[PDB]
Amino acid sequence: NDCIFEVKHEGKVTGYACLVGDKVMKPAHVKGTIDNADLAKLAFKRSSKYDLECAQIPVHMKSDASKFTHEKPEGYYNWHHGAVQYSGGRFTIPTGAGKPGDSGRPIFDNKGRVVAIVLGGANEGARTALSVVTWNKDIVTKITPEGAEEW
């Protein structure tokens, strides 16, 4: 909504990297060398079981980082392509709202604070369940509904 900071990483865009808290992160499944030429020289810590590379933001740019909160009420949140329903601890969107290439987009709460980063979706009828990187208190985690392909 009020924040567009998902920096692209390739002329052939496949996902986006984001600044949140004091860290830049991006999904580890999408190839490319991050653009802007300042984050490109940054060294990334990679996790395949979490499918994410992350690094510390340079200070001069970390004012651009979005707010962070781990607390996730049941209900509606907002992201770039619309609204996300958090039901049963799982994020879902209308079918077709997400396609390959929108991975790495932060999910915001009503205050505009990041709570999750989308990785992919799984098609169930008129809805799609999100395979997504989220957090609990001081620990990154991943939610992968069955049959989700990677975005």
């Binding site: 004091d22 860290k23 990679r46 962070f68 001081d138």
Partner: protein, 52 residues
């Protein structure tokens, strides 16, 4: 020579896979913003903090 090579290789494997265990145990903390690593864990794994 064979015994010395075998023992040195075992020591190298031990230290390298200790480094692997360090990386596996440490990466999730370096991914989570805030990085409130407990002081005891920092001493055990011999790390530096990101927030000074």
């Amino acid at each position: 020579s064979v015994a010395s090579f075998v023992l040195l290789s075992m020591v190298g494997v031990a230290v390298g896979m200790c480094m692997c265990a360090r990386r596996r145990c440490i990466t999730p903390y370096e991914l989570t913003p805030g990085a409130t690593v407990p002081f005891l864990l920092s001493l055990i794994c011999c790390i530096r903090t990101a927030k000074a």
